[PDB]
């Protein structure tokens, strides 16, 4: 609380060194103003991609809300920052969250007309439908369903085969 504030300031300046330094002296990645922003929000909103690598690589909080409920991944898309939503994304941002004005990332990009943006957080929505859609196979153990979560986590692109396969199993398994 003191380099923190150097912290903030040199994320939204967007001065790449001097945050590498801040951080090699141990600067604390998940510092706020009283409105609730951390150096991951002001790097995103203010759109400096290595300043985000370097935090999000340092562990900072990917899904941080601020006072209005915002998180970087809505910050970046109000910019239309392909470049770091991706990234944010590969971090494991909440694709579906929502904050004070019942916006979504998505909601987003249609305001803005961005058709790239769209489908870049279109298809990330699949995934996680398909993670919950396996989640609610009734007849299957813990150890095939934790074992195709697992397979979903290695290789995200994979997931509606993966689903498939569920099903077979699942039919497969009906019960009496």
């Known amino acids: 609380s003191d380099l923190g504030k150097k912290l903030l300031e040199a994320a939204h300046a967007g001065q790449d060194d001097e945050v590498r330094i801040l951080m090699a002296n141990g600067a604390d990645v998940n510092a706020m103003d009283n409105f609730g922003v951390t150096p991951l929000h002001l790097a995103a909103y203010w759109g400096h991609f290595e300043i985000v690598e370097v935090l999000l690589k340092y562990g900072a909080d990917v899904n941080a ?4 409920g915002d998180t970087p991944l809505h ?9 770091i939503v991706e990234v944010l994304l590969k971090y494991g941002a909440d694709v579906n969250a ?10 987003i990009s249609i305001d803005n007309g961005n058709e790239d943006l769209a489908e870049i957080l279109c298809k990330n929505k699949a995934q996680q439908a398909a993670f919950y859609c396996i989640l609610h196979m009734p007849n299957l153990n813990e150890a095939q369903r934790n074992g195709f979560i697992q397979s979903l986590k290695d290789d995200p ?10 099903k ?7 019960p009496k």
Do not use: R
Not at 65 to 68: G, I, P, V
Not at 75 to 83: I, R, S, V
Not at 98 to 107: C, E, I, L, V, Y
């Open 65 to 68: 809300s601020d006072a209005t």
């Open 75 to 83: 910050l970046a898309a109000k910019w239309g920052y392909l470049g």
């Open 98 to 107: 929502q904050d004070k004005f019942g916006k979504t990332a998505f909601d």
């Open 157 to 166: 692109s994979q997931s509606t085969n993966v689903l498939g396969e569920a």
């Open 168 to 174: 077979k199993l699942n039919e497969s398994q009906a």
